[PDB]
Amino acid sequence: VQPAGSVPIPDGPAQTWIVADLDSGQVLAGRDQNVAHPPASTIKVLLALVALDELDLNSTVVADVADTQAECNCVGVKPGRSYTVRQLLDGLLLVSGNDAANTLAHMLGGQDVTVAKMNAKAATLGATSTHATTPSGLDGPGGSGASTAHDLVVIFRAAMANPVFAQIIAEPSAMFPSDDGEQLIVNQDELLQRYPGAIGGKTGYTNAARKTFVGAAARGGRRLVIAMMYGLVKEGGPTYWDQAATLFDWGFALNPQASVDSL
């Protein structure tokens, strides 16, 4: 659970969580880090990994009508318009665009083959408790899907190893093509502004998943990665931003030579 002799970790709304070293892969602490829950939009990180593995950032696609129809939220993809893989990754990661997700899946061969590719990729990473049902993290034909706090940081750790991902996820904003003729899209990960040394994160929410989060931070040459699942913020209670900051602060204060397990 945590190293013998370390100080208490303050509780927060997230029901499962884990704190790991992003570079060493060592686990510092966890609560039910292997219990499965729906991932919501944290799974968009797994989608981004498949896109980065298979698609050139300069490659383009002309969106279909089906690409542009999706449940909240959307970046604003429009039918008949052209988009680069980089632009779709911006929409996917900065504002959690489900149309961007749809459109990337189009490029990877459709919804079904994209989900299959995502599940194959998770297996190769050792994320063996993860089952995506949609590219977006929305509910789909197979239901809400599944992952675990452990599997989420494994997936995020692999994404952070790609410097393209590390850059996009930490981007404050980007310019996205619109029908007049560019719109500023702003990174929704508030940890970037709330917690110094934060280097990126992905939030998620559905009714089935409740709130989810996976992200990383750096302090003095040390880098940590955390994931948090299945939480609801109560009025006057700690937020996901509070708990993320507390987990990072606990982890950086921990003896740098201490760990409880390996990813």
CATH code of 107's domain = 3.40.710.10
Beta bridge partners of 222: 219
211 is in an annotated binding site: no
Instruction: Give the C-alpha separation, 81 to 157, whole Å.
Output: 33
Instruction: Give the C-alpha separation, 155 to 178, whole Å.
Output: 31
Q: Residues with Cβ < 8 Å from 6, sequence gap 6 or more?
A: 29, 254, 255, 258
For this entry, resolution in Å reads 2.0
- The answer to whether residue 262 is catalytic is no
Contact 77, 107 (CB under 8 A): no
Coil, strand or helix: which one is 26?
strand
User: How determined?
Assistant: X-ray
- The answer to whether residue 41 is catalytic is yes
Domain count, the chain: 1
Instruction: Give the C-alpha separation, 26 to 19, whole Å.
Output: 9
Q: Residues with Cβ < 8 Å from 118, sequence gap 6 or more?
A: 43, 46, 47, 50, 132, 135
Q: Residues with Cβ < 8 Å from 234, sequence gap 6 or more?
A: 13
CA 215 to chain centre: 7
Instruction: Give the C-alpha separation, 208 to 159, whole Å.
Output: 25
Contact 176, 91 (CB under 8 A): yes
* Domain extent for 65: 1-263
Which candidate in 44, 117, 121, 211 is catalytic? 44
Q: Residues with Cβ < 8 Å from 187, sequence gap 6 or more?
A: 94, 95, 170, 171, 172, 173
Cis peptide before 97, with omega less than 30 degrees from 0?
no
Cα separation of the two ends of the chain? 14
Contact 36, 129 (CB under 8 A): yes
CB atoms within 10 A of CB 166: 14
CA 128 to chain centre: 17
What tokens were used for 153?
């940081």
Which candidate in 59, 78, 82, 96 is catalytic? 96
Q: Burial letters for 74-107: b for 16+ Cβ neighbours within 10 Å, e otherwise?
A: bbbbeeeeebbbbbbbbbbbbbbbbbbbbbbbbb
- Nearest partner of 59 among 115, 92, 112, 103, judged by Cα: 103
Q: Is 163 exposed, middle or buried (0-12, 13-18, 19+ CB in 10 A)?
A: exposed
Contact 79, 63 (CB under 8 A): yes
